[PDB]
Amino acid sequence: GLPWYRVHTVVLNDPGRLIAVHLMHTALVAGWAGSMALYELAVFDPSDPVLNPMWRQGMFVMPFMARIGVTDSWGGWSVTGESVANPGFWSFEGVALAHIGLSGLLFLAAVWHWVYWDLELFRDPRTGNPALDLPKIFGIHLLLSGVLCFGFGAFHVTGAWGPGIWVSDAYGITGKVQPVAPAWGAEGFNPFNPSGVASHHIAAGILGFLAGIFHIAVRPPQRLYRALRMGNIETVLSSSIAAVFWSAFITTGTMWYGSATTPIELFGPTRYQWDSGYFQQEIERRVENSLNEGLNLSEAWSRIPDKLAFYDYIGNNPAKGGLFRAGPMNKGDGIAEAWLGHPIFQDKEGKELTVRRMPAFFETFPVILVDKDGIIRADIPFRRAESKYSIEQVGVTVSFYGGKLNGQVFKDAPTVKKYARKAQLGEVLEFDRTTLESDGVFRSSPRGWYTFGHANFALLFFLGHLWHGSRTLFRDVFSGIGAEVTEQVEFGAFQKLGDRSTK
Amino acid sequence: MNVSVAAYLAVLLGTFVPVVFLVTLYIQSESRKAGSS
Amino acid sequence: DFSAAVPFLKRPSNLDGTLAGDVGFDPLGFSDVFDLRVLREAELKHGRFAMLAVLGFLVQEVYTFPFFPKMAPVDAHDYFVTQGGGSQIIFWISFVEIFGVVALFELIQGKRDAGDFAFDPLGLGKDEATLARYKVAEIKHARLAMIAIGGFIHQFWVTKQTVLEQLGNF
Amino acid sequence: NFMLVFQAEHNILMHPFHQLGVAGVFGGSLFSAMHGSLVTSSLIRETTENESANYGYKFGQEEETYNIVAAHGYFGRLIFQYASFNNSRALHFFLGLWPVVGIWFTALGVMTMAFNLNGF
Amino acid sequence: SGPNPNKQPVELNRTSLFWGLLLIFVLAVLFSSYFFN
Amino acid sequence: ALRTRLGELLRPLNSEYGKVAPGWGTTPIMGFVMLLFFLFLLIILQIYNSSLIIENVDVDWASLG
Amino acid sequence: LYKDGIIQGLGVEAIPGAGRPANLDGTLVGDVGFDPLGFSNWLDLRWAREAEIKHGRVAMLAATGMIVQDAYKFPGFEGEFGGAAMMKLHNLAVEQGAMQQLLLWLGLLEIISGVPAIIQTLNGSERQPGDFGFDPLNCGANPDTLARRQLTELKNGRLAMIAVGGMVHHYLLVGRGPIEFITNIPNFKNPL
Amino acid sequence: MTPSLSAFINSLLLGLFVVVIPIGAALFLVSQSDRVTRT
Amino acid sequence: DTVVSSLYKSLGGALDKTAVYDEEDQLLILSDMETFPETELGRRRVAQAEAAGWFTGNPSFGKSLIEYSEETKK
Ligand code: CLA
Ligand code: CLA
Ligand code: CLA
Ligand SMILES: CC1=C(C#C/C(C)=C/C=C/C(C)=C/C=C/C=C(C)/C=C/C=C(\C)C#CC2=C(C)C[C@@H](O)CC2(C)C)C(C)(C)C[C@H](O)C1
Ligand SMILES: CC1=C(C#C/C(C)=C/C=C/C(C)=C/C=C/C=C(C)/C=C/C=C(C)/C=C/C2=C(C)CCCC2(C)C)C(C)(C)C[C@H](O)C1
Ligand SMILES: CC1=C(C#C/C(C)=C/C=C/C(C)=C/C=C/C=C(C)/C=C/C=C(C)/C=C/C2=C(C)CCCC2(C)C)C(C)(C)C[C@H](O)C1
Ligand SMILES: CC1=CCCC(C)(C)[C@H]1/C=C/C(C)=C/C=C/C(C)=C/C=C/C=C(C)/C=C/C=C(C)/C=C/C1=C(C)CCCC1(C)C
Incomplete structure (x- = not known):
């Protein structure tokens, strides 16, 4: 009969049942959204947003709620850190319950369409057979897509009749949902300009709307109709899978590299902020202009916010996790409690050494303390015998500036080594490893997991697009080849391949 | 060995569910073959 | 054969020459793509708006009402979008334009002439001959006022000088 | 572990017999995919649309289950006519030959690096 | 709305049963050592 | 088989299955817009790639503020 | 055709011994039979001459343009552009907007007059190529004067292009404007 | 117009006049000359 | 012809008007199965195989649900 991998092909030529299965899939996806939101809310810890934000807790789907308006909870807390006094219905809980209710309603609609499948809407008046006028259905759907895109751009994102979207500063320290005016011009095409989102969703939507008016009105040319097999729904499936993996690759790129639509405080920093020293340079210039203002190292480093110092830490890097190191980022190094300050390394004389930072590539990196110019001065040797650059020989002391360990000058070699090991990983922090029983191996942020999943899905959907394009373009030879193939495939039988009017 | 605990459920159910699916697909088909005769 | 207005171009087909002020001028050829009656109604309505606008531009400059403060015409829109009046005017224009929609639906079915609303309150052009001459005069003056209102306003922007002022001092 | 130590001590990757084995396995995969694709692609129609194409072949039948001419011509147009194996027996001899000779060579390479005749 | 003409039977012969069971069990064997961690 | 109000309302939208414009139709403008959209995608790809640096377009996190 | 078979026409041949192109017969004006690289076969001689004529027109305006712009700058324009000539003038003009207004108005002429006329001729209009109607002084009424005239418009216009x-190339190589360039003829004592 | 934008526009122009237009012209001429028979 | 007329917004698609209905059934799988005549060698071989017993003990082998079902109903 119908093998296990063809079982969903019975609904290929039954439009009502096709709507039913689409409804069931939509119901399942909405139910997943609601259930994931509920589970995340059950396991979320909203107490500390600066050292235990959403992305440190493995919050995958909540940032997408917080990205475009839903920053509050019925429990009287906000992802931004403020305490909500009178939360509205559209909180995290309300969104979750709405998605569950929509899942139930879509399930009921799927049941109705599965039972009542033989509607005159799906039957061709000319022939009476079940059929779908796909070019016009596409125009209707493109009208709907354009209207929704324009509405989102003009009302939701601009906040004319909506919350706006998440906007943040350069360093993720002061971010909130707010309206964004549309950025018409070249600046709208900056991926890190949130305003360019609005300018897009308006303008693109308008064009989409206009495109809908074309596709409802204008019938396809016969040439493209026969070439693309527009009367075959599997053409639509192939092209849709094509566009879908295209979008998946684009979203994967904007996730990994970052953009205005992937704020760091919602998904964690990127690997490239760590690679280029994006936050280290900002902290350095902050303390430098503080020093130029007459402040000292203690005061200058005390003015650095804990959030900014937390970003300057390799454990927050998405390129440090593992494929099977599962769970929240707090399950690895731990839950960050406090910042111990900048460990200046004053050598025996007083020169400032600096521990070379771990690159993301290396699981384990040697602890070497390079000089200002960078000749190696001291390090933690592997072979102690005949050691030249041991911290014992050179002599080093760790003076802490800022943080809870401020103003403390350790000058023993052991305690210097212990904080050299910490300074190898960027800024040094205190961690709670007991609440979640953390095992001391780094995990990936939601940024990395999104990138992984959608990269793999994009490749697999490229395979699917190949398969279904092949099927729709080779429908006539699905069951096998006939005897006609033997005459045309002969070399030189016809001047033009395939065509038999030639010779 | 400090191993995970939901990994037991993951392995056992990810083995069980496809296995029972295959067994059901085989038994259904055979039943139908017997019923035809 | 060939339009008198544009001799190198050929005469636009739908512009036979019956409508007033029709000199076969349709180079891009919108008449061939859309109903000529709808375009004629749009022309007359925009042009009447422009004729009133051109008159009011100057009448405001010479005389602003005492109960209102004195602002150059363009500076006024921003004033009355808050004073309140702006809303009242645009509100009433919408009210009349709803019956304009009804009249447009009549126009589509051919039950009404383009740009015609039977407004002869004082029976000015009640003569067949005159109504023709007036229809020609109306369309020309409208076509001119379309240019004039745009100039007035765009000049204020590039030169803060109500037309009367600017003309006085270039 | 044995792989990494062997590479460290003998440089098996640069040793040409291991390269012949890599050619053998990669070519075996290539020719397996190619042969399966061309045989599956030119299957003679013996099956209805609500039925797996594999049931178009009956075990012990006398007739060929696919058109060798169609696959041969397609592969000739794909690259050039002379490259294709018009003979099926020669085709299958080559299929049996390429991986067997490659794995013979890499086994012999490991046998020779046992006595420390290392890669380049 | 009455009987659907698109109804078709579904099958899984015994060779396919053993292939599927082998695939699932071997995937479990491979990925169990990674899920437990 | 079944007639419904919504079915009657939406029937004109699914009544021209198989209706095709004769010949090439609108394919030339389709190709022209395809060219334009390809150029647009190339422009934005080179903008983020920083192979196409546009003035007042700073592709960087620091452009946020 | 003015002097058909004499100055223009079939008998004439720019590259004698080489056949008159297949699509270059007598009727087109300015046909000495010179289409060495055989574009005639691939191109619509209609569009072809729309172009030739148009070019020659903008080129005449332009040549005289440069020559006069080097004798008599209009004073107001002169003061704004400070004596800049040719390319530099374009750069500064494009700033005062002179060149921006010119762009808008010539493009409006094109979208109103040039484009629709092109659509018509290329599809059966009797408005032969380049035949906008411009005879305000009705300078030629003779069926004769006008042939001589068309040939002369094509050719004076080719010298033009x-x-x-x-003039432009010389100006890039050496500084001087065309009136300036003939003077100081060597032009290399000082690039200018 | 930045140098990168000028380079991009120039790249499009050279792609037209060095790759697309030559190949298209050659295809057109060869297809019009060497024609199949009995089509 | 005009600019707007050239795009033929009015004429449906610029080249589109008066559309025909396409006839080909694009959702159609061919079903021209081929019969291969039985040679004398084939008859001899199946005779030997039946004498040995290769045609008994598993009548449903190599047959789908639909094929074997239609066979069992003759
Ligand atoms: C003035 C109005 C306006 C403005 C300001 C914008 C603004 C924007 N548009 Mg645009 N857009 C507009 C109008 C406008 N649009 C209109 C009218 C349309 C037509 C409907 C579009 C259609 C459109 C699309 C389809 C896309 C944009 C995108 C964008 C964004 C570009 C920056 C970015 O993040 O790129 C990031 C993305 C890119 C630079 C595109 C990459 C394209 C390459 C070629 C993809 C390659 C994929 C391939 C399969 C990979 C293979 C290899 C790999 C596996 C290794 C930005 C928000 C892009 C977007 O959504 O970005 C998130 C986008 O893809 N716009
Ligand atoms: C692409 C979508 C996506 C993404 C990016 C994420 C991302 C995340 N989820 Mg997940 N999640 C998803 C879909 C997704 N989820 C879905 C659909 C569900 C519903 C089942 C869940 C349910 C879920 C829960 C319940 C939890 C998370 C959590 C997390 C976080 C940790 C991920 C982790 O540890 O992976 C670990 C992944 C692996 C060990 C396997 C990855 C490698 C491949 C895919 C294995 C394939 C095996 C294959 C099928 C063979 C099996 C054979 C069988 C016989 C055994 C992270 C933010 C955690 C969190 O922090 O929540 C607060 C958490 O507790 N997610
Ligand atoms: C939305 C996209 C989409 C859609 C609508 C379809 C639809 C179809 N595909 Mg599929 N296909 C897709 C994507 C899609 N495909 C992709 C991305 C690939 C590449 C891997 C394929 C590869 C593929 C092949 C190779 C074949 C099909 C076939 C089919 C048809 C029957 C499938 C069936 O009955 O499976 C029944 C499936 C099962 C009974 C169990 C599958 C269990 C999977 C493997 C694991 C668990 C999945 C999990 C629960 C959900 C995934 C989440 C998602 C986000 C990825 C049907 C028309 C068949 C066909 O053409 O028949 C004529 C066929 O042979 N498809
Ligand atoms: C042949 C042909 C064509 C063509 C063409 C061509 C090449 C046409 C060329 C046309 C030219 C050269 C037109 C020049 C116009 C100049 C004007 C109106 C100046 C205005 C100055 C002002 C207002 C000023 C000023 C000042 C101000 C304000 C400030 C003061 O401090 C300074 C100053 C005093 C200077 C086309 C392409 C259409 C094709 C067609 O087939 C036919
Ligand atoms: C923005 C804004 C506002 C506003 C506003 C308003 C009221 C704006 C109104 C703008 C208008 C009416 C502009 C008109 C432009 C006309 C042009 C370019 C005509 C050119 C014709 C030509 C060249 C003819 C050419 C010709 C042709 C074809 C045929 C004959 C020959 C020739 C003559 C050569 C406020 C003040 C309310 C404030 C608010 O906060 C926002
Ligand atoms: C404005 C501006 C700029 C500019 C610019 C401009 C205005 C550029 C203009 C360029 C033009 C008009 C170039 C013409 C080249 C003509 C050639 C090579 C003809 C050769 C003919 C031959 C060999 C004929 C031979 C023959 C002869 C004699 C005998 C008969 C046979 C025949 C073959 C016909 C920039 C670029 C500087 C940028 C600036 O920011 C803004
Ligand atoms: C196996 C595997 C492969 C790749 C990805 C991954 C590794 C994650 C893993 C998991 C994959 C997948 C696809 C998991 C998805 C899970 C899904 C879709 C779960 C479904 C959740 C849905 C739920 C609760 C819906 C709840 C609905 C309810 C109460 C409805 C009730 C109602 C009804 C029915 C009528 C109206 C009233 C009311 C009360 C609303």
């Missing part, structure tokens, strides 16, 4: 080019 060759010379605009030279």
Whole structure:
């Protein structure tokens, strides 16, 4: 009969049942959204947003709620850190319950369409057979897509009749949902300009709307109709899978590299902020202009916010996790409690050494303390015998500036080594490893997991697009080849391949 | 060995569910073959 | 054969020459793509708006009402979008334009002439001959006022000088 | 572990017999995919649309289950006519030959690096 | 709305049963050592 | 088989299955817009790639503020 | 055709011994039979001459343009552009907007007059190529004067296009404007 | 117009006049000359 | 012809008007199965195989649900 991998092909030529299965899939996806939101809310810890934000807790789907308006909870807390006094219905809980209710309603609609499948809407008046006028259905759907895109751009994102979207500063320290005016011009095409989102969703939507008016009105040319097999729904499936993996690759790129639509405080920093020293340079210039203002190292480093110092830490890097190191980022190094300050390394004389930072590539990196110019001065040797650059020989002391360990000058070699090991990983922090029983191996942020999943899905959907394009373009030879193939495939039988009017 | 605990459920159910699916697909088909005769 | 207005171009087909002020001028050829009656109604309505606008531009400059403060015409829109009046005017224009929609639906079915609303309150052009001459005069003056209102306003922007002022001092 | 130590001590990757084995396995995969694709692609129609194409072949039948001419011509147009194996027996001899000779060579390479005749 | 003409039977012969069971069990064997961690 | 109000309302939208414009139709403008959209995608790809640096377009996190 | 078979027409041949192109018969004016690289076969001689004529027109305006702009700058324009000539003037003009207004108005002429006329001729209009109607002084009424005239418009206009080019190229190589360039003829004592 | 934008526009122009237009012209001429028979 | 007329917004698609209905059934799988005549060698071989017993003990082998079902109903 119908093998296990063809079982969903019975609904290929039954439009009502096709709507039913689409409804069931939509119901399942909405139910997943609601259930994931509920589970995340059950396991979320909203107490500390600066050292235990959403992305440190493995919050995958909540940032997408917080990205475009839903920053509050019925429990009287906000992802931004403020305490909500009178939360509205559209909180995290309300969104979750709405998605569950929509899942139930879509399930009921799927049941109705599965039972009542033989509607005159799906039957061709000319022939009476079940059929779908796909070019016009596409125009209707493109009208709907354009209207929704324009509405989102003009009302939701601009906040004319909506919350706006998440906007943040350069360093993720002061971010909130707010309206964004549309950025018409070249600046709208900056991926890190949130305003360019609005300018897009308006303008693109308008064009989409206009495109809908074309596709409802204008019938396809016969040439493209026969070439693309527009009367075959599997053409639509192939092209849709094509566009879908295209979008998946684009979203994967904007996730990994970052953009205005992937704020760091919602998904964690990127690997490239760590690679280029994006936050280290900002902290350095902050303390430098503080020093130029007459402040000292203690005061200058005390003015650095804990959030900014937390970003300057390799454990927050998405390129440090593992494929099977599962769970929240707090399950690895731990839950960050406090910042111990900048460990200046004053050598025996007083020169400032600096521990070379771990690159993301290396699981384990040697602890070497390079000089200002960078000749190696001291390090933690592997072979102690005949050691030249041991911290014992050179002599080093760790003076802490800022943080809870401020103003403390350790000058023993052991305690210097212990904080050299910490300074190898960027800024040094205190961690709670007991609440979640953390095992001391780094995990990936939601940024990395999104990138992984959608990269793999994009490749697999490229395979699917190949398969279904092949099927729709080779429908006539699905069951096998006939005897006609033997005459045309002969070399030189016809001047033009395939065509038999030639010779 | 400090191993995970939901990994037991993951392995056992990810083995069980496809296995029972295959067994059901085989038994259904055979039943139908017997019923035809 | 060939339009008198544009001799190198050929005469636009739908512009036979019956409508007033029709000199076969349709180079891009919108008449061939859309109903000529709808375009004629749009022309007359925009042009009447422009004729009133051109008159009011100057009448405001010479005389602003005492109960209102004195602002150059363009500076006024921003004033009355808050004073309140702006809303009242645009509100009433919408009210009349709803019956304009009804009249447009009549126009589509051919039950009404383009740009015609039977407004002869004082029976000015009640003569067949005159109504023709007036229809020609109306369309020309409208076509001119379309240019004039745009100039007035765009000049204020590039030169803060109500037309009367600017003309006085270039 | 044995792989990494062997590479460290003998440089098996640069040793040409291991390269012949890599050619053998990669070519075996290539020719397996190619042969399966061309045989599956030119299957003679013996099956209805609500039925797996594999049931178009009956075990012990006398007739060929696919058109060798169609696959041969397609592969000739794909690259050039002379490259294709018009003979099926020669085709299958080559299929049996390429991986067997490659794995013979890499086994012999490991046998020779046992006595420390290392890669380049 | 009455009987659907698109109804078709579904099958899984015994060779396919053993292939599927082998695939699932071997995937479990491979990925169990990674899920437990 | 079944007639419904919504079915009657939406029937004109699914009544021209198989209706095709004769010949090439609108394919030339389709190709022209395809060219334009390809150029647009190339422009934005080179903008983020920083192979196409546009003035007042700073592709960087620091452009946020 | 003015002097058909004499100055223009079938008998004439720019490259004698080489056949008159297949699509270059008598009717087109300015046909000495010179289409060496055989574009005639691939191109619509209609569009072809729309172009030739148009070019020669903008080129004449342009040549005279440069020559006069080097004798008599309009004073107001002169003061704004400070004596800049040719390319530099374009750069500064494009700033005062002179060149921006010119762009808008010539493009409006094109979208109103040029484009629709092109659509018509290329599809059966009797408005032969380049035949906008411009005879305010009705300078020629003779069916004769006008042939001589069309040939002369094509050809005076070709000198035009060759010379605009030279003037620009010379200006890039050596500083001087065309009136300036003939003077100081060597032009290399000082690039200028 | 930045140098990168000028380079991009120039790249499009050279792609037209060095790759697309030559190949298209050659295809057109060869297809019009060497024609199949009995089509 | 005009600019707007050239795009033929009015004429449906610029080249589109008066559309025909396409006839080909694009959702159609061919079903021209081929019969291969039985040679004398084939008859001899199946005779030997039946004498040995290769045609008994598993009548449903190599047959789908639909094929074997239609066979069992003759
Ligand atoms: C003035 C109005 C306006 C403005 C300001 C914008 C603004 C924007 N548009 Mg645009 N857009 C507009 C109008 C406008 N649009 C209109 C009218 C349309 C037509 C409907 C579009 C259609 C459109 C699309 C389809 C896309 C944009 C995108 C964008 C964004 C570009 C920056 C970015 O993040 O790129 C990031 C993305 C890119 C630079 C595109 C990459 C394209 C390459 C070629 C993809 C390659 C994929 C391939 C399969 C990979 C293979 C290899 C790999 C596996 C290794 C930005 C928000 C892009 C977007 O959504 O970005 C998130 C986008 O893809 N716009
Ligand atoms: C692409 C979508 C996506 C993404 C990016 C994420 C991302 C995340 N989820 Mg997940 N999640 C998803 C879909 C997704 N989820 C879905 C659909 C569900 C519903 C089942 C869940 C349910 C879920 C829960 C319940 C939890 C998370 C959590 C997390 C976080 C940790 C991920 C982790 O540890 O992976 C670990 C992944 C692996 C060990 C396997 C990855 C490698 C491949 C895919 C294995 C394939 C095996 C294959 C099928 C063979 C099996 C054979 C069988 C016989 C055994 C992270 C933010 C955690 C969190 O922090 O929540 C607060 C958490 O507790 N997610
Ligand atoms: C939305 C996209 C989409 C859609 C609508 C379809 C639809 C179809 N595909 Mg599929 N296909 C897709 C994507 C899609 N495909 C992709 C991305 C690939 C590449 C891997 C394929 C590869 C593929 C092949 C190779 C074949 C099909 C076939 C089919 C048809 C029957 C499938 C069936 O009955 O499976 C029944 C499936 C099962 C009974 C169990 C599958 C269990 C999977 C493997 C694991 C668990 C999945 C999990 C629960 C959900 C995934 C989440 C998602 C986000 C990825 C049907 C028309 C068949 C066909 O053409 O028949 C004529 C066929 O042979 N498809
Ligand atoms: C042949 C042909 C064509 C063509 C063509 C061509 C090449 C046409 C060329 C046309 C030219 C050269 C037109 C020049 C116009 C100049 C004007 C109106 C100046 C205005 C100055 C002002 C207002 C000023 C000023 C000032 C101000 C304000 C400030 C003061 O401090 C300074 C100053 C005093 C200077 C086309 C392409 C259409 C094709 C067609 O087939 C036919
Ligand atoms: C923005 C804004 C506002 C506003 C506003 C308003 C009221 C704006 C109104 C703008 C208008 C009416 C502009 C008109 C432009 C006309 C042009 C370019 C005509 C050119 C014709 C030509 C060249 C003819 C050419 C010709 C042709 C074809 C045929 C004959 C020959 C020739 C003559 C050569 C406020 C003040 C309310 C404030 C608010 O906060 C926002
Ligand atoms: C404004 C501006 C700029 C500019 C610019 C401009 C205005 C550029 C203009 C360029 C033009 C008009 C170039 C013409 C070249 C003509 C050639 C080579 C003709 C050769 C003919 C031959 C060999 C004929 C031979 C023949 C002869 C004699 C005998 C008969 C046979 C025949 C073959 C016909 C920039 C670029 C500087 C940028 C600036 O920011 C803004
Ligand atoms: C196996 C595997 C492969 C790749 C990805 C991954 C590794 C994650 C893993 C998991 C994959 C997948 C696809 C998991 C998805 C899970 C899904 C879709 C779960 C479904 C959740 C849905 C739920 C609760 C819906 C709840 C609905 C309810 C109460 C409805 C009730 C109602 C009804 C029915 C009528 C109206 C009233 C009311 C009360 C609303």
